[PDB]
Design a protein around this ligand. Structure first.
Ligand code: SAH
Length: 199
C-alpha cells in the first residue's frame, strides 16, 4: 500500500523495481511521520530513491499531495510513502535499501529501538542490502546505554552492527523539517542519541 495524494493504492514489486531503476541508491525512513524529513532529503539528492514508511496515512496527506504536483510546483519523482508498520514485513521491501533510518521515534517504534525488540529490528534489517548503512536517532526525557555490550550484542543479533554512538544537541535537530523534530529542537534542552553503523 502506497499513497498517491490522499488516495491509497497498491504498488507491485515489479512497479517498484522499475522506479528504483532511475536511481543509484535507495533510502528507507521507518516511522517517517509527516513526510517533511524525507521531502528535504529527496529535494537535496536526486540520485537516491526515498521510501518513507508509516502506519498513519492521515499525517502524510499534505506532503503526499505535494510530491504529486508538477516539479515546478514542488513535485518530486524520487519519493514514495508506504503505509505499513515495523511489524508488517512487506515482502517488496526485502533486500532493497542502501540505507535505513529511524528518526525521533515515539510510541511502539521507540521501544522497539530502545529495548530493543530483536524480532522487529530483524524485520527492519531484512529491508537492507548486504552493504546497508543504518542510523537510529532517539530521545526520551527532557550514551552509556547505547555503548553497552548488551545493547551492542542485541542489535548485532538483529543484523545491526553499531559503529558509532554520538550524543547530539537541539541545534543539530533544528536541521530537520518535520513538525515533530521542530518541537523537539525548539523546546527544552534535550539529549539526542544517534546509533549508527552497518547491516
Ligand atoms: N510500530 C511502528 N511501525 C512503524 N511506525 C511507527 C510504529 N510506531 C510508531 N510509528 C510512527 O513513528 C512516528 C513517530 S513521530 C514522527 C517521527 C518522524 N521520524 C519525525 O522525525 O518526524 C509516528 O508517525 C508513528 O506513526
Amino acid at each position: 500500500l502506497i499513497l498517491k495524494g490522499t488516495k491509497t493504492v497498491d504498488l507491485s514489486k515489479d512497479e517498484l523495481t522499475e522506479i528504483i531503476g532511475q536511481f543509484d541508491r535507495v533510502h528507507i525512513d521507518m516511522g517517517t511521520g509527516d513526510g517533511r524529513n524525507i521531502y528535504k532529503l529527496a529535494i537535496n539528492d536526486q540520485n537516491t530513491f526515498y521510501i518513507g514508511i508509516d502506519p498513519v496515512k492521515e499525517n502524510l496527506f499534505d506532503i503526499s499531495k505535494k510530491i504529486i504536483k508538477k516539479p515546478s510546483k514542488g513535485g518530486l519523482s524520487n519519493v514514495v510513502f508506504v503505509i505499513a508498520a515495523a511489524e508488517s514485513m512487506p515482502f517488496e521491501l526485502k533486500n532493497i535499501a542502501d540505507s535505513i533510518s529511524i528518526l525521533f521515534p515515539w510510541g511502539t517504534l521507540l521501544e522497539y529501538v530502545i529495548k530493543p525488540n530483536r524480532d522487529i529490528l530483524s524485520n527492519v534489517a531484512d529491508m537492507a542490502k548486504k552493504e546497508a548503512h543504518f542510523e537510529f536517532v532517539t530521545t526520551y526525557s527532557d550514551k552509556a546505554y547505547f555503548l553497552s555490550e548488551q545493547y551492542k550484542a542485541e542489535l548485532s543479533n538483529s543484523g545491526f552492527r553499531i559503529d558509532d554512538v554520538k550524543e547530539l544537541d537541539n541545534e543539530y535537530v533544528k536541521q530537520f523539517n518535520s513538525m515533530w523534530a521542530k518541537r523537539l529542537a525548539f523546546g527544552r534542552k534535550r539529549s539526542f542519541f544517534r546509533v549508527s553503523g552497518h547491516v
